[PDB]
Subunit: 348 residues, 4 copies
């Protein structure tokens, strides 16, 4: 009396099976769900005009990379791309299927300031979400992503209680709606690196946020077995002149997770934030030298997989082979890092 | 450090002044915000076809009633009506302004089941809400309404914790967004009368829900001075063969409010739910014989103001004068009831 | 199913009747519950040795003051005094009864630091409390007092979430246990004036704390009708060179209460903290010029009633008449202030 | 700003080292902390008079069992026993030390009904706890135990929100106080088997309770690395005519833990409740066939280790050797079960 109705065994099985496929050993996620605007920025850094045609060429360049599925279990898409065709006319989802890569879809509607906070953000998107999920499933998506953002600012008391409460509520609602529609939800509570705080401050805040997030997931009847977490690694703030060592980042990151995340969750797929391609790989590798772990520790990387690919492509289609080569180099690096085998390229 | 930024004094003053105008002595709200579909039902009960033209005729019939503003402080509109013209071509908002009635706008997007509950409902509508509020203010609205719904079912543990938490969260977010856009939010947590429960059960549940709602309003930095509450009266369930006496309903309703509602809130504008026109008036009157109170106890009635008006109109335009006469009779009854002067027509 | 069992009507009636007697117009509480140690301090300020005999002489001096019950509704006692005799051999409780003053009893066991906080305090005393309440009732007490303490320090994030949560939990448990044993609980969440913060900061913190306290009282099934609140007034911090004006203190204090305290509570009996005898009276008077209010605004004063009495007594028993004269002068001042009739001696 | 002060590294290290020693592979806890009264019952079942002398004989019989430390990592004592001598005059703690068994101490003060609940229980004992912990550490204890109790009753909505909130608060305060005094806290939220509910109902309730408990531990800055959990196994209610199979009990128990318990916790030491000696062993064994796990799954058994020992002793001192033999048989069975090697004697 008063508890959650039981989830459909058939639905739960599909979700858990797909979450484990996504969190497969030696593999991770390619985050290619840059919005129309976010991608304008990238394309600018190489002097390419943000036409549909160019976005389609580039997503094709990414997803038609031969052998990518050896290292990439899933790809997060923007809505445009989920329903797009490559220049050659092949649906993007069909390129993914041919490599055995699972399509995923970004489903949040972005950020809005919480009234009477100092620019702290709510994530919007619950309205119509259930119906969007149904359509996206029919289109071939099997997982979803919703990004929430928090800031650290000791002087301003950020993240405030209202920020944390809102982030947790939105994530939990989103996750339960996804699971009702047969999509594995990636739960992304990103604590931004902005500021001059120490790694120990990041650790404290991450622990408080994740404790709140997982309590809310429980309150909303979210099946952990069919969900994934996409958190920040625990690091110094980005205004620190010294970056924390890989050993330190690995230690505090793993500690923060083991202190808060129940082990029924199958996978933790880190965001890379502002990290270099090489740091993102080495930090993950260092965590998986500390293994074995109670959940898979892996990656969901955008820039950390794409930065060099883009710089090599330059908008020039004859640079397509070289660009896919460097994507593969980074996919391989991060797949090896998942296993603690990348060769380069206790505090309570 | 970590508290709500202070609200603009200029914005707060406008909100508080408008909330007090709405909760004016001897006056209340006419709820005329029936959706396209909800109004189909009413129109059916008198054999009228739900054309735009008929909706416009009827809303015109309501709002052009001469002298209505003696008893009606505000009118909640559906979006269609806010931007509609009367048959004669006069904007609906201009009919309201001529009587000195403040226009209000329904801003929720209706109900959706919470995953893995027994059909318990979340209220949707936060996405785009801030931008809608801006447009609605420019169109002449000065207050808003968002309806959440809860059910009593002892056998099923309803309302569940998740239901109450969701209702409170949605209301608090909605209220803070309204106030950021210069709209007075009406906070409507409606506990449905469905079921066979006693009035004392309704009292317990209402108290728990309102305690949760007002804690969440505080958490979200909602200005009580510039808000209104629209709760159910406390009554027996609708499957009870005996309705509670007016004295009983008045006693438990006032008790539930005084136990939970801080007195900085200017007004409590009751919904009538399924009550007869006469019960709705007599119940309010009985509460205001128990005065004076720490907040204004008044009405926000739809059917309880319109039922006879509609039955008298019948779709026939020559019945327009008679229909407006009975609307006035009910507006007067409820204005007098607000004052505890309607003449008919302690337990811990 | 799952709600609080109903309180005994007979018990509830007694509690509500006694709370209203305590919060009687033109009257307030004399706080004379200084512990053995706290009183050592006072006695030191006039060169008196803290013998039992002297404590008994002084409490006798206080409670045998002729006509004190005109202005004093109740007296909070320390346990020693509840079971003590005057030098002449008359039980202290019998001196109170002769003036029609209701005996009350301090029941907390003092403060202990919350582990891993910066010296933030839990209030101890729940163990054996129910049994102590029974004994104290048999001894003649009809109300109780439990003091919790919070600090403001923006730089340290005080009061922290853990501090507020603990204060609210302890107060709510204590209050429900009192009411189960026929004692009216005085709920005292004291926010200390320590620091250099502005009155607006005190207002914000007081509102957050009281919102949390009253939510917890509701959660624990506390009957507001049979309880009293003893909060700090809202003021500048004690390290401010300029004290806030009486008008300001009255405005923010009343505002903070109306924003958080449900009006079923019969009385708010302010603590005076470090205020002068005259400020404590003038601040209360100023609040009751702003009346009428939804609850009685009155006093529960220790030093603000006793400071001059003590200075006049000096330990010399021939100074007993003069000492009782000045106690009466202050009792009268504060009784008149309760009515907004003491003659001296909107921001959102 | 506003977070927990960091725990002493030296204190944390001791706690984590001792918790891991207690949760050692192939070992578990002997719960011998029966109060004066609880032990009267046991002694009655074999016609022994509850003298101090007999309690001392029996605790001596238990703790002087040769080779017990092969299977027993720790022993929970009642306060009497911690400061007691064996008949031969050897301190009980010295018998434990000789086998390398760590002494632990029960520190709660038992149960009291929460006002206006249907006999739902708060655990008392926080007052003086910090000072008791200091004394107990000096006496040789290195871990503590605090028992909270919850009931399942769907018809009554048990466990109610107030019950769960209280249990979590008391456990978290107790745990943080222990850790401040260098004692490893065993966190025991026992959900009683009373009633006719299914194992799936027990699973739901256990998950809700543990989610609340671990959120509160986080809120109170409890170091999971230096704590232990002592939960009920997940089973049918005791009024069920069919007991769940060992495979079922193992499945739902492990599931409930992996869904709620962060893996930084070193050990889960089950209580046996009303289970037979053999069921308690077989259920644990079945869980550790499902290994390896993210935390040690082991035992903290009273009756399940002592029932036969007592029946064999009978109060007769010549039966002492036989009694210790059967204690050893059960210690061995449960040590082997910890390893998934006892030989007898997915649903979402």
């Amino acid at each position: 009396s008063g508890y959650g109705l039981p989830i459909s065994q058939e639905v739960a099985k599909e979700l858990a099976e797909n979450a484990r496929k996504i969190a497969a050993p030696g593999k991770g996620i390619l985050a290619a769900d840059e919005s129309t605007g976010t991608i304008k920025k990238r394309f600018d850094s190489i002097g390419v005009e943000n036409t549909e045609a160019n976005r389609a060429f580039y997503r094709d360049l990414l997803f038609s990379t031969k052998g990518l599925g050896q290292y990439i279990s899933g790809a997060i898409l923007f809505e445009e791309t989920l329903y797009q065709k490559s220049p050659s006319g092949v649906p993007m989802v069909d390129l993914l299927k041919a490599e055995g890569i699972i399509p995923g879809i970004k489903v949040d509607k972005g950020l809005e300031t919480l009234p009477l906070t100092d620019d702290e953000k709510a994530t919007m998107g619950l309205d119509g979400l259930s119906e969007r999920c149904k359509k996206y499933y029919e289109a071939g998506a099997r997982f979803a992503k919703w990004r929430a953002v928090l800031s650290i600012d000791p002087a301003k008391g950020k993240p405030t209680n209202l920020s944390i409460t809102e982030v947790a509520h939105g994530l939990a609602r989103y996750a339960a709606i996804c699971q009702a529609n047969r999509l594995v939800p990636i739960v992304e509570p990103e604590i931004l690196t902005d500021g001059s705080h120490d790694i120990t401050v990041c650790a404290e805040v991450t622990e408080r946020v994740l404790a709140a997030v997982f309590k809310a997931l429980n309150d909303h009847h979210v099946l952990l077995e069919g969900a994934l977490l996409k958190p920040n690694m625990v690091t110094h703030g980005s205004d620190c002149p010294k970056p924390a060592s890989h050993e330190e980042i690995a230690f505090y990151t793993v500690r923060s997770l083991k202190r808060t995340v129940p082990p029924a969750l199958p996978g933790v797929m880190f965001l890379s934030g502002g990290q270099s391609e090489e740091d993102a790989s080495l930090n993950l590798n260092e965590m998986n030298k500390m293994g074995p772990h109670p959940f898979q520790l892996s990656f969901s990387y955008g820039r950390a997989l794409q930065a060099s690919c883009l710089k090599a492509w330059k908008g020039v289609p004859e640079n397509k082979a070289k660009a896919q080569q460097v994507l593969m180099e980074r996919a391989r690096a991060n797949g090896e890092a998942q296993l603690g085998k990348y060769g380069g390229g206790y505090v309570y």
